[PDB]
Amino acid sequence: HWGYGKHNGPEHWHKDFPIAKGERQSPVDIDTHTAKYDPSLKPLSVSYDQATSLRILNNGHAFNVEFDDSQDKAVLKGGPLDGTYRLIQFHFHWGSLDGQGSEHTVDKKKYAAELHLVHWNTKYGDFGKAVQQPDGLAVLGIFLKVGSAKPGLQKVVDVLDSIKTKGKSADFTNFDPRGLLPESLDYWTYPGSLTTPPLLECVTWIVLKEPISVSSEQVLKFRKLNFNGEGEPEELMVDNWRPAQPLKNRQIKASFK
Ligand SMILES: NS(=O)(=O)c1ccc(CNC(=O)COc2ccc3ccc(=O)oc3c2)cc1
Ligand SMILES: [Zn+2]
């Protein structure tokens, strides 16, 4: 099955998922000089005050913090989006060293990690139906750089010891994702895909320009997780990122001048 190793990593995914070579794959490099300011874009509306987190899960490729999406509680709207998108989960991609880890890049710069807050379009009823539509998902991407600690991340970091291996989960209620946002909501946006199999081309990507800072100790704790299950040979969960894909016939639009 697919993963991030030499024998099953991103270069191999097209054999089981031919859409890997498709026309709107993610992530991409964001060339800041070529992205055009679009004055018709609106400010992003991030309404997380009623977010209800439930659980954190190691799925063998990252860890997901899962939310109650049975009602309009935490929603993303505005920006490039039409309609209402419900938060279902967030997760990260990160590197073995601080010089790599993000999926999107900015003028070829790689950040240490990248947070993805995943939302689905409520006009399609459920997540599984949404991923079958070109406007089914909105993913908010936030870069992480290593410097000062992010206080709002520490509750995530301190639970990772309890979900070290694939298939482990832990209760994770009352976590506030507003503590993971940077000050500015300036963003780039383009049409793309899921960055892991099945690589479906259903995502409006919204990537924030301002990164958040996390400490070296915080990201070192990410790198102690395992891709393997309990009792199996230890394979550290590092470098779980897909590299940039061809932009093809797409324009990246900037919300800011
Ligand atoms: N990194 S990202 O872009 O933010 C991102 C990436 C992915 C998701 C949601 N995940 C999925 O859709 C996977 O679904 C699957 C995969 C494999 C099988 C194998 C057998 C089978 O029968 O069912 C399957 C169903 C959300 C956000
Ligand atoms: Zn992701």
UniProtKB/Swiss-Prot annotation:
Class of enzymatic activity (EC top level): lyase
Documented effect of changing residue 59 to A: Reduced activity
Documented effect of changing residue 195 to A/C/H/P: Strongly reduced activity
Effect annotated for changing residue 61 to W: Impaired activity, rescued by 4-methylimidazole (4-MI). Impaired activity, not rescued by 4-methylimidazole (4-MI)
Localization per record: Cytoplasm; Cell membrane
Active-site residue numbers: 61 (proton donor/acceptor)
Recorded consequence of changing residue 103 to A/Q: Strongly reduced CO(2) hydrase activity
Catalysed reaction equations from the record: hydrogencarbonate + H(+) = CO2 + H2O; urea = cyanamide + H2O
CDD domains linked: alpha_CA_I_II_III_XIII (cd03119)
A single GO molecular function term of this UniProt record: zinc ion binding
Regulation acting on activity, per entry: Activated by X-ray, histamine, L-adrenaline, L- and D-phenylalanine, L- and D-histidine, L-His-OMe and beta-Ala-His (carnosine).
Effect listed in the UniProt record for changing residue 59 to T: Reduced activity
Major subcellular location class: cytoplasm
Phenotypic consequence of residue 4 to F: Enhanced activity
Outcome (variant: residue 103 to D): Normal CO(2) hydrase activity
Site entry (Involved in the binding of some activators, including histamine and L-histidine), positions: 89
Cofactor remark from the record: Zinc. Can also use cobalt(II) with lower efficiency, but not copper(II), nickel(II) and manganese(II).
Keyword vocabulary terms for this entry: Acetylation, Cell membrane, Cytoplasm, Disease variant, Lyase, Membrane, Metal-binding, Osteopetrosis, Phosphoprotein, Zinc
SUBUNIT field: Interacts with SLC4A4. Interaction with SLC4A7 regulates SLC4A7 transporter activity. Interacts with SLC26A6 isoform 4 (via C-terminus cytoplasmic domain).
Family the entry assigns: Belongs to the alpha-carbonic anhydrase family.
Protein name: Carbonic anhydrase 2
Gene name, Swiss-Prot/TrEMBL: CA2
